[PDB]
Design a protein around this ligand. Structure first.
Ligand SMILES: *[C@@H]1O[C@H](CO)[C@@H](O)[C@H](O)[C@H]1NC(C)=O
Ligand SMILES: *[C@@H]1O[C@H](CO)[C@@H](O)[C@H](O)[C@H]1NC(C)=O
Ligand SMILES: *[C@@H]1O[C@H](CO)[C@@H](O)[C@H](O)[C@H]1NC(C)=O
Ligand SMILES: [Ca+2]
Ligand SMILES: [Ca+2]
Ligand SMILES: [Ca+2]
Ligand SMILES: [Ca+2]
Ligand SMILES: [Ca+2]
Ligand SMILES: [Ca+2]
Ligand SMILES: [Ca+2]
Ligand SMILES: [Ca+2]
Ligand SMILES: [Ca+2]
Lengths: 272, 247, 272, 265, 36
């Protein structure tokens, strides 16, 4: 809407929309397989639903969605709910991967497709990036000069290309904006999309279950921010994790806010 | 930018400087000349190279492109092997080999817009990948006795400078793009079996192709040529040659 | 200069000095040998120069300086450029080492020599520290009472001394301020100097390529700051790191500021 | 207390001449002599430093303020000179085979250079003004240079064949190279043994003082062959011994340090 | 006027008419074909 909004500082604070947004909204948790493994119970979902019922969320409003691993979830995530919580295990051997997952789900991306064979692409601004998903993505790039030949690489000999990814499920790639790059991708197993980073996604909430805060959403090295919906916990079990989430679910959803852009079940919009 | 772009950097009334940036699939082939001396058949006169034409048709990104390639060699070394002065010893007066000091020239031409009226070219440059040329097995068919076989020889061709050239033939004349290649000797050596010669690097000039249809190497080239503004002009390609009537 | 400056708030915001400081300044990266190894290319320096050229930095202004180890670099770091970037890997076993390196290059020091045998020294303020460089430094110190005797140590028995370093290439030693210490140092391989910490060096920018923020520049255990020319990346390759540094070099140089004190190549001033 | 800024300072002409800073600058400052090994050799004593310091004491320089730092030869000192003191004196022997060496040394220490690094393999450099030079240090420097033309080709030299290059230096420990300003030069240097730096000459260094012990004034500091100056801190002496030289330096240290002024930087 | 001059008697957007007046030393040679 191009039009403006007006208001006033004399009007009164309305009642709490909590205890109604719960009813008319759905919640969805994303837990790892490790949780159900350490639990070894078959009714923990109904248990947690009966617990949420005290906090106000009715019976058929909570949902749980298993994901075997961070990368197997990073492979084309699909968050289709009204309030998403993600529980993310920390591992220094997966830091950039579980930061790219954050950069993908916390934010809202507008993605076009890419045809590497017929075209050579480039990034315009500091919000255009190349996000690639699949089972094993090996991405190499050769930057180009004014006459469409190679710079420290041979436009044909793919060994001379510069390797930015090695058998990765989800890669988020930023290159020098203002030059044309020739790409080599495992197109059989991975799809790559030229995506622009729009305003953030206020529907989801990442919870790092272990180590200190490391997620650097912004690809630029200067900022390294910590948003409100990027939480941290210290853990030794998973039942305590889930009881803590259930006990402090009001704060989480107060840190989250329903979306404004559109209705969409993927983690990225498509505009061809 | 497309992999097969065509851009205009200047345009006057009749002429225009057109830039071209295109990928190519050079499929070339050696060809050997074998001259056997008379007598019984135990003496060979020359085993040398001959410039070799090869025309093919490959698939671009949704287009069919006809091509014409011509391989040649320069600066080859002339070896020889003479084991006796009698008519019954196997002798080879002169045979050619390729090493570092030699070069491999490859003229290339296509039916594309870049080579339609190309007579002037600047800003020439190319990115070519390196390949490995391996020799084959040539059985010297002696009249009687044993049958020595020249077998082996491997040598790696690496990209080098680029220039222009003209492919002359009895059918077509082509103002073509000349790709050079330098040689780095490889591990497989060539040796005449049943003879006192072996473990000498290079490539033999008897069967270089190794029973192959061609040697394939992919590349990209980028130039700027003078093309008349009107995209209907044509430069003579075909020929009708009657040269060397004295010969 | 001692005089005062005066100004106004009506005066206008002059044009961007970027795109001229790039022409009239130099940039120098300090990368690890690990990066050259993982790259395995002999033209990546020219590649990055041609890339920077699009960002405005001309050809002969960008420089690269290989350093094999954080400690080998910590041995008398020689920064002589107008804009220095340092790429620093993360290792828990080298946390204090790569923190002392930061503490040394980020800040500006004024150093006098130390003659351990002939004299006995003390610290006066919370910025008068003892920095020791060399290939293998093993330092021991004995505090002394009012009447030039030992406290928990003997003036003669070098084994009673209190060890603070064990074969460390760079050490920054802070001892109690107000008491005289008798030192024992491997002077054959190391030089120790009594230095005072001045205002910060705004010419250098550290970039922790790996794990969580650990650098405690200030020795006091109360601040635990994080300055502006101190960044953090999460990484799996190095070409992505370099493309990132390039695409975001303008933010880096906006986070840095050319020096004020003087022209110097060492990381510390000498005044005898 | 504003740093990095240059502001106008005012004054008058009726103010009185303040007291002498000498006899206090000595106590709050340090002095450092740079003498050759020849001198200690001729002396053949192990207490001459203590002797000279006890003598300095009478002129006001206390014990722990004076320092002596030995160097074996002019070129071995030319290799990365580290003059880090509040007052520096450098005794320098005269030899016709080393005139350029001990002119380059003077040009390097007497003046305060702003040195940026250099990467020969990638970049081709040029000198912009009459103060931009290339100073190379090390144990054996051998420098060759090819001027280039507008289209990045050579001028009496081939960009590839290093032999065609023009040799300006041949196994020198310190070279200060000035080439024609305006033409990109490609270089070849023994980078294994020498480091070369693009240095712009700023205002002089008033903290050092060269003392030529022998022959006449030869030092052509200024590369331009028109000035041929002789600054106040470029001294000369005649010698048949070294004890006389040191006694003279001591007895006239006050004039020396009146000719020397502490740095600005 | 030199011996090996190079002049531009006209100049259009791309082409140009140039005049060349140069000295040369033609070092030529015959060759015979014998057939027995
Ligand atoms: C808001 O809360 C107050 C206090 O409980 C209550 O009296 C009021 O009725 C509420 N508002 C509405 C619209 O019911
Ligand atoms: C200052 O910036 C404005 C806006 O780009 C421009 O029009 C003007 O010419 C600039 N002036 C100077 C002196 O750079
Ligand atoms: C300056 O010198 C005069 C004459 O020697 C002396 O009387 C005066 O006290 C000196 N100034 C100071 C501040 O001591
Ligand atoms: Ca990844
Ligand atoms: Ca490469
Ligand atoms: Ca970018
Ligand atoms: Ca340390
Ligand atoms: Ca003790
Ligand atoms: Ca202290
Ligand atoms: Ca010299
Ligand atoms: Ca020459
Ligand atoms: Ca000059």
């Amino acid at each position: 809407i191009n039009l403006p909004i007006t208001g006033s500082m004399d009007t009164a604070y309305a009642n709490s929309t909590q205890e109604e947004t719960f009813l008319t909204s759905t919640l969805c948790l994303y837990y790892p397989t490790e949780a159900a493994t350490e639990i070894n119970d078959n009714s923990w979902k109904d248990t947690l639903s009966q617990l949420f019922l005290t906090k106000g969320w009715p019976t058929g409003s909570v949902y749980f969605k298993e994901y075997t691993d961070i990368a197997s979830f990073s492979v084309d995530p699909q968050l289709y709910c009204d309030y998403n919580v993600v529980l993310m295990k920390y591992d220094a051997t997966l830091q950039l991967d579980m930061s790219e997952l954050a950069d993908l789900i916390l934010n809202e991306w507008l993605c076009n497709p890419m045809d590497i064979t017929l075209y050579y692409y480039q990034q315009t601004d500091e919000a255009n990036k190349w996000i690639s998903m699949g089972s094993s993505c090996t991405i190499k790039v050769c930057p180009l000069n004014t006459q469409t030949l190679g710079i420290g690489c041979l436009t044909t000999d793919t060994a001379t290309f510069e390797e930015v990814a090695t058998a990765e499920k989800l890669v988020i790639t930023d290159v020098v904006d203002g030059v044309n790059h020739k790409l080599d991708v495992t197109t059989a197993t991975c799809t790559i999309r030229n995506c622009k980073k729009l305003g953030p996604r206020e529907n989801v909430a990442v919870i790092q279950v272990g180590g200190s805060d490391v997620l650097d959403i912004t690809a630029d090295p200067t900022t390294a921010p910590q948003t409100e919906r990027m939480m941290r916990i210290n853990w030794k079990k998973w039942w305590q994790v889930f009881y803590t989430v259930v006990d402090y679910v009001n704060q989480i959803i107060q840190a989250m806010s329903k979306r404004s852009r559109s209705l969409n079940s993927a983690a990225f919009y498509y505009r061809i | 930018a497309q992999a097969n772009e065509d851009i205009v950097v200047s345009k006057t009334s009749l002429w225009k400087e057109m830039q071209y940036n295109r990928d190519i699939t050079i499929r070339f082939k050696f060809a050997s000349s074998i001259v056997k001396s008379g007598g019984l058949g135990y003496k060979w006169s020359e085993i040398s190279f001959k410039p070799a034409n090869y025309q093919y048709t490959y698939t671009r990104d949704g287009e069919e492109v006809t091509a014409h390639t011509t391989c040649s060699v320069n600066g080859m070394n002339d070896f020889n092997f003479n084991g006796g002065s009698l008519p019954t010893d196997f002798v080879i007066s002169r045979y050619e080999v390729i090493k570092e000091n030699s070069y491999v020239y490859v003229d290339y031409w296509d039916d594309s817009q870049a080579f339609r009226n190309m007579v002037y070219v600047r800003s020439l440059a190319a990115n070519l990948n390196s390949v490995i040329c391996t020799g084959g097995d040539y059985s010297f068919a002696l009249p009687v006795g044993q049958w020595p076989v020249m077998t082996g020889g491997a040598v790696s061709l690496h990209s080098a400078g680029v220039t222009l050239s003209t492919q002359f033939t009895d059918f077509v004349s082509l103002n073509s793009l000349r790709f050079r290649f330098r040689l780095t000797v490889e591990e497989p050596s060539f040796s005449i079996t049943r003879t006192r010669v072996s473990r000498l690097y290079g490539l033999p000039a008897a069967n270089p192709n190794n029973g192959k249809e061609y040697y394939e190497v992919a590349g990209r080239f980028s130039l700027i040529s003078l093309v008349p503004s009107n995209d209907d002009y044509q430069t003579p390609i075909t020929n009708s040659v009657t040269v060397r009537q004295d010969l």
